[PDB]
Structure formats: C-alpha cells, structure tokens
Amino acid sequence: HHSVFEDDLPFLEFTGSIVYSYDASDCSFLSEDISMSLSDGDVVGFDMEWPPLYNRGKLGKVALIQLCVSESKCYLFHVSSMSVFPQGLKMLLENKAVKKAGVGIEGDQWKLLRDFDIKLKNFVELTDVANKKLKCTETWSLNSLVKHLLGKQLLKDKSIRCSNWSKFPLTEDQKLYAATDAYAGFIIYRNLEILD
Ligand SMILES: Nc1nc2c(ncn2[C@H]2C[C@H](O)[C@@H](COP(=O)(O)O)O2)c(=O)[nH]1
Numbered sequence: 001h002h003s004v005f006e007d008d009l010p011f012l013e014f015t016g017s018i019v020y021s022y023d024a025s026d027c028s029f030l031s032e033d034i035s036m037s038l039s040d041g042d043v044v045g046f047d048m049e050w051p052p053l054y055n056r057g058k059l060g061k062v063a064l065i066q067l068c069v070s071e072s073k074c075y076l077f078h079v080s081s082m083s084v085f086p087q088g089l090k091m092l093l094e095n096k097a098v099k100k101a102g103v104g105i106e107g108d109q110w111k112l113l114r115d116f117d118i119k120l121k122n123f124v125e126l127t128d129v130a131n132k133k134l135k136c137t138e139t140w141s142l143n144s145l146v147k148h149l150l151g152k153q154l155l156k157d158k159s160i161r162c163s164n165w166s167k168f169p170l171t172e173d174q175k176l177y178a179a180t181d182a183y184a185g186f187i188i189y190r191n192l193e194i195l196d
Pocket residue numbers: 107110
C-alpha cells in the first residue's frame with residue numbers, strides 16, 4: 001500500500017525535433033549553428049550517456065552528448081561514432097558565454113575531462129539552482145525535480161537507460177530517452193529562472 005505522493009505520474013517525453021549527428025565535422029558545424037542562435041548568457045539543457053561496459057579498469061568513454069537549445073529542438077551528438085572529438089562541440093562546451101544546465105553535471109565535467117580532455121565551462125547544477133529559487137535544501141535528482149516542477153516522471157526502462165550507448169545507430173527509444181534528459185534540464189532551468 002502506497003500514498004498518493006507515490007502514485008505513478010505521466011512520463012516526460014520530448015516531442016520536438018531531434019537532430020542526430022554521428023560525424024565529427026557535421027557535429028562541429030551543428031555546434032556553430034547553435035552558437036549562431038544564442039546570445040551571451042543563454043542556457044542549454046545538457047546530459048551525456050555512456051555504455052555500462054568497462055575498459056582498461058574504468059567506465060567506458062562518454063558515447064553521447066545531448067544539448068537541448070529550446071523547447072522544440074534537441075541535438076544528439078553520438079561522439080562514440082566519430083573519428084575524433086568534434087572541435088565545434090569542444091568550443092561550445094568550453095565556452096563561458098553559454099551556460100549548460102543539468103543534474104550531476106559536475107560529475108559529467110570530470111568524466112568529460114578524463115575521457116576527452118575537454119573542460120566544461122559555465123555549467124550549473126540544477127540541484128543548487130532549485131534549492132536557491134525554491135528556498136529549500138533537498139538532494140534533488142533529475143527525476144525528483146521533474147516530478148516536483150512538472151508533475152511527470154522520467155522514462156525508466158533500465159534496458160534503455162543502461163543500454164549500449166556506443167552502439168551505432170541509436171534506436172528510437174534511446175534517442176527519446178537521451179533527448180528527454182537534456183530537455184528536462186532546459187525546462188527545469190527555464191521554469192526556475194522566472195521565479196521571483
Ligand atoms: N573534484 C574532483 N572530483 C572528481 C575528479 N575525478 C572524479 N571526481 C568525482 C566524480 C564522482 O562524483 C566521484 C567519484 O568518482 P567516480 O569513480 O567517477 O564515481 O569523484 C577530479 O579530478 N576532481
């Protein structure tokens with residue numbers, strides 16, 4: 001027997017346009033497209049995924065990077081299928097003029113550095129933004145924030161969230177799951193920011 005607070009909520013699902021990129025140069029130009037549509041201070045939703053496979057003593061490298069730039073468009077950069085880490089993406093991630101929002105993003109910062117020697121700049125942990133704007137002191141997760149602020153829960157099929165993200169091509173379920181994590185970060189930040 002469970003309480004009403006424990007009831008199952010509708011699932012959060014991104015229904016906008018998903019741009020799938022799996023080639024380095026394509027990704028670099030896409031990143032410049034993004035840079036052309038934003039101004040200093042603008043935010044983007046961010047998340048990354050990696051396969052549950054270990055390589056030479058540590059987690060396999062980041063295989064996918066997701067960026068949600070608006071409520072209708074998310075980019076899926078399948079870096080595991082690229083021959084080199086796209087320069088345009090590196091610049092966007094290292095650009096202090098663009099804020100990246102997510103949960104557990106500091107951890108992503110360190111894994112990105114170890115995996116590609118990329119130094120994520122101007123990232124924001126939604127946990128801190130939420131505690132600040134919502135005047136509380138909670139240990140938020142992306143899911144708990146989605147529930148609290150949007151009245152929905154995140155897709156939870158473990159065989160998808162813990163699937164082989166380095167396997168090309170991504171399935172439609174993987175794209176949905178991955179794009180929605182980035183979308184969540186964008187929407188959450190947007191909604192929290194307007195509060196005053
Ligand atoms: N400050 C800092 N934290 C790190 C560094 N490398 C890893 N971490 C963090 C990431 C995790 O939150 C935690 C435990 O590491 P992990 O094996 O990635 O689960 O330590 C680093 O170079 N600096």
